[PDB]
Write a protein that binds this ligand. Structure first.
Ligand SMILES: O=C(CN1CCCC1)Nc1cccc(Cl)c1
Length: 168
């Protein structure tokens, strides 16, 4: 059973746990817990094939940069979780991209751009703007609703497929 390394990255105040735990035990966490190091492994059926998803939720704190580069090198698929409720996180996507490019030693890496907090009316960045910048990354963009849990399933499905496309 293939254990795909899923690296969940994002900014502070986005709601990474609201997406990671979401499809693990089917639960939307509201409480703000500063995720430092959590691991989620579940048998996920992707493309009619049950694979053991190895998800690692880390801290978005910039105090962990050296340790970040280490696990980033061991990561295969990167989950860029950013909230559309904050424009800073959108302009910082390229910032994190540069670091990922360095650790992966490649300009091409299987990743997905998920617009978290799409269930919030306080939307700042528009869907088209998000897709516009996504073309440069070569990665798909999906609006991941946290409270409604809409788009989260397809987002995970697409990511795994991207990783498989990279491998084979
Ligand atoms: O390291 C783990 C957890 N597995 C490793 C063996 C115990 C289960 N997951 C993970 C996910 C993405 C990136 C990296 Cl570096 C690790």
């Amino acid at each position: 059973m293939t254990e795909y390394k899923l690296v969940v990255v994002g900014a502070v105040g986005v709601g990474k746990s609201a997406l990671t735990i979401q499809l693990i035990q089917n639960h939307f966490v509201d409480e703000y817990d500063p995720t430092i190091e959590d691991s989620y492994r579940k048998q996920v059926v992707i493309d009619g094939e049950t694979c053991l998803l190895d998800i690692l939720d880390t801290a978005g704190q910039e105090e962990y940069s050296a340790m970040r580069d280490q696990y980033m090198r061991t990561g295969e698929g990167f989950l860029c979780v950013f909230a559309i409720n904050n424009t800073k996180s959108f302009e910082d996507i390229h910032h994190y991209r540069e670091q990922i490019k360095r650790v992966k030693d490649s300009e091409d890496v299987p990743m997905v751009l998920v617009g978290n907090k799409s269930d919030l009316p306080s939307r700042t960045v528009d869907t088209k703007q998000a897709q516009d910048l996504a073309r440069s990354y070569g990665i798909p963009f999906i609006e991941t609703s946290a409270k409604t849990r809409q788009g989260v399933d397809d987002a995970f499905y697409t990511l795994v497929r991207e990783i498989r496309k990279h491998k084979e």
